[PDB]
Protein backbone atom coordinates (compact mmCIF):
# COMPACT_ATOMS: atom_id res chain seq x y z
CA UNK A 1 0.00 0.00 0.00
CA UNK A 2 2.13 2.83 1.41
CA UNK A 3 5.07 1.79 -0.78
CA UNK A 4 2.96 2.01 -3.95
CA UNK A 5 2.02 5.49 -2.66
CA UNK A 6 5.71 6.37 -2.28
CA UNK A 7 6.95 5.26 -5.72
CA UNK A 8 4.20 7.47 -7.15
CA UNK A 9 5.42 10.53 -5.24
CA UNK A 10 8.84 9.85 -6.73
CA UNK A 11 7.41 9.68 -10.24
CA UNK A 12 5.18 12.50 -9.12
CA UNK A 13 8.58 14.10 -8.63
CA UNK A 14 11.10 12.56 -10.98
CA UNK A 15 9.15 13.85 -13.97
CA UNK A 16 10.27 17.27 -12.76
CA UNK A 17 13.95 16.37 -12.40
CA UNK A 18 16.97 16.75 -14.61
CA UNK A 19 19.53 14.77 -16.58
CA UNK A 20 22.14 14.95 -13.81
CA UNK A 21 19.84 15.22 -10.78
CA UNK A 22 18.41 11.84 -11.80
CA UNK A 23 21.84 10.80 -12.97
CA UNK A 24 23.13 11.04 -9.35
CA UNK A 25 19.80 9.88 -7.88
CA UNK A 26 20.22 7.01 -10.32
CA UNK A 27 23.94 6.46 -9.73
CA UNK A 28 22.99 6.64 -6.10
CA UNK A 29 20.38 3.97 -6.91
CA UNK A 30 22.92 1.21 -7.64
CA UNK A 31 25.18 2.84 -5.08
CA UNK A 32 22.62 1.55 -2.54
CA UNK A 33 20.96 -1.64 -3.83
CA UNK A 34 24.42 -3.22 -3.96
CA UNK A 35 24.48 -2.50 -0.26
CA UNK A 36 20.93 -3.84 -0.39
CA UNK A 37 22.58 -7.01 -1.59
CA UNK A 38 25.63 -7.14 0.72
CA UNK A 39 23.39 -6.31 3.72
CA UNK A 40 21.09 -8.89 2.12
CA UNK A 41 24.02 -11.24 1.48
CA UNK A 42 24.97 -11.28 5.14
CA UNK A 43 21.43 -11.95 6.31
CA UNK A 44 21.35 -15.06 4.14
CA UNK A 45 24.88 -15.85 5.29
CA UNK A 46 23.32 -17.35 8.45
CA UNK A 47 22.20 -20.45 6.54
CA UNK A 48 24.25 -22.66 8.85
CA UNK B 1 36.54 -3.02 -4.76
CA UNK B 2 34.68 -5.02 -7.42
CA UNK B 3 31.35 -3.18 -7.05
CA UNK B 4 33.36 0.04 -7.44
CA UNK B 5 34.07 -1.23 -10.94
CA UNK B 6 30.34 -2.03 -11.12
CA UNK B 7 29.55 1.59 -10.16
CA UNK B 8 31.88 3.15 -12.70
CA UNK B 9 30.50 0.69 -15.22
CA UNK B 10 26.89 1.72 -14.45
CA UNK B 11 27.96 5.33 -15.05
CA UNK B 12 28.85 5.12 -18.75
CA UNK B 13 25.56 3.47 -19.56
CA UNK B 14 23.78 6.44 -17.94
CA UNK B 15 25.84 9.42 -19.12
CA UNK B 16 24.59 8.71 -22.65
CA UNK B 17 21.07 7.61 -21.74
CA UNK B 18 18.42 10.19 -22.64
CA UNK B 19 15.94 12.18 -20.57
CA UNK B 20 12.85 9.98 -20.15
CA UNK B 21 15.02 6.90 -20.75
CA UNK B 22 17.12 8.02 -17.78
CA UNK B 23 13.88 8.39 -15.81
CA UNK B 24 12.31 4.91 -16.04
CA UNK B 25 15.29 3.40 -14.33
CA UNK B 26 14.59 5.68 -11.38
CA UNK B 27 10.94 4.66 -11.08
CA UNK B 28 11.73 0.93 -11.28
CA UNK B 29 14.40 1.56 -8.68
CA UNK B 30 12.52 3.22 -5.85
CA UNK B 31 10.33 0.21 -6.42
CA UNK B 32 13.49 -1.90 -6.36
CA UNK B 33 15.03 -0.67 -3.09
CA UNK B 34 11.68 -0.98 -1.28
CA UNK B 35 11.32 -4.64 -2.29
CA UNK B 36 14.47 -5.01 -0.22
CA UNK B 37 12.98 -2.74 2.47
CA UNK B 38 10.42 -5.50 3.12
CA UNK B 39 13.32 -7.87 2.69
CA UNK B 40 15.78 -6.56 5.24
CA UNK B 41 12.73 -6.01 7.46
CA UNK B 42 11.74 -9.52 6.44
CA UNK B 43 15.35 -10.43 7.25
CA UNK B 44 15.31 -8.75 10.64
CA UNK B 45 12.00 -10.29 11.66
CA UNK B 46 13.34 -13.76 10.95
CA UNK B 47 16.37 -13.24 13.10
CA UNK B 48 14.46 -12.53 16.32
From Swiss-Prot, chains A, B:
Superkingdom classification of source: Bacteria
Stimuli inducing this protein: Present at very low levels in nutrient-replete cells, and at 50-fold higher levels in nitrogen- or sulfur-deprived cells and to a variable extent (<10-fold) during phosphorus deprivation.
Function: Involved in phycobilisome (PBS) degradation during nutrient deprivation. May mark the PBS for degradation by covalent association with PBS components or may disrupt the PBS via ionic interactions.
Family: To chloroplast ycf18.
This protein's name: Phycobilisome degradation protein NblA
Organism: Synechococcus elongatus (strain ATCC 33912 / PCC 7942 / FACHB-805) (Anacystis nidulans R2)
